C-alpha cells in the first residue's frame, strides 16, 4: 500500500492549491521512505517552507533544497547523500516525480515534478511517485516559472505531510 503525501503551495505567501503524490515505496522503498519523511518533517528536517527555485515551462518543476535554495543543496534522510536505488520506473509523462541529482549517486532531497515526458531522463534520475491529485496546480505552478528556471514569483511548501 503505496504511501500518499501532500504539498500545499503558495505564491508569495498566498495559497495555490495542494499537490498530493503516490510514492511508489513497492519499487523504490529507499527513495520514496526519503520522500515521505522529508514531507512529513518528522526526523527535525524536510520539505515545510521550501523553495521551488527551478521551474521550466513544459518542462519540470524542481525543488526541495531545502538548506541552500538555489539548487546547489539538500540532504537525504540518509545522509547528505544516497545512492540511485535502481531506474525499474521511467518518466513516461507529466506528473512524474524524479530525483534531481549532481551526478551518479548522488541523491539528496531534490526533486522534480515532470509537465512533460521526459524520456532521456530514464537510466539517470530515479523515478519514486507520481502526481494523484493537484496536477492543474503543479501547472498553475509552471507559469510562474521561465525559460531558464527562474521563478518571477516565490513558490513554496507552505506545508507538507501524509495522506495515507
Ligand atoms: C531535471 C532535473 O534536473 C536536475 O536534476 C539538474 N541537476 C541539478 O539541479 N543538480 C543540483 C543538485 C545538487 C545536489 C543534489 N543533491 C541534487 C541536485
Known amino acids: 500500500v503505496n504511501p500518499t503525501v501532500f504539498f500545499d503551495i503558495a505564491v ?6 495542494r499537490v498530493s503524490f503516490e510514492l511508489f515505496a513497492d519499487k523504490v522503498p529507499k527513495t520514496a521512505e526519503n520522500f515521505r519523511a522529508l514531507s512529513t518533517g518528522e526526523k527535525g528536517f524536510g520539505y515545510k517552507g521550501s523553495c521551488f527555485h ?13 538548506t541552500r535554495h538555489n ?3 539538500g540532504k537525504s534522510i540518509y545522509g547528505e547523500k544516497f545512492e540511485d536505488e535502481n531506474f525499474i520506473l521511467k518518466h513516461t509523462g507529466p506528473g512524474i516525480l524524479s530525483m534531481a541529482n549532481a ?19 530514464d537510466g539517470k534520475h530515479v523515478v519514486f511517485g507520481k502526481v494523484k491529485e493537484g496536477m492543474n496546480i503543479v ?3 509552471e507559469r510562474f516559472g521561465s525559460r531558464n528556471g527562474k521563478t518571477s514569483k516565490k513558490i513554496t511548501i507552505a506545508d507538507c505531510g501524509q495522506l495515507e
Open 12 to 17: 508569495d505567501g498566498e495559497p495555490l492549491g
Open 54 to 66: 527551478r521551474i521550466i515551462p513544459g518542462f519540470m518543476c524542481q525543488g526541495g533544497d531545502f
Open 71 to 73: 539548487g546547489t543543496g
Open 103 to 121: 551526478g551518479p549517486n548522488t541523491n539528496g532531497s531534490q526533486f522534480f515534478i515532470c509537465t512533460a515526458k521526459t524520456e532521456w531522463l
Open 139 to 141: 501547472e498553475a505552478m
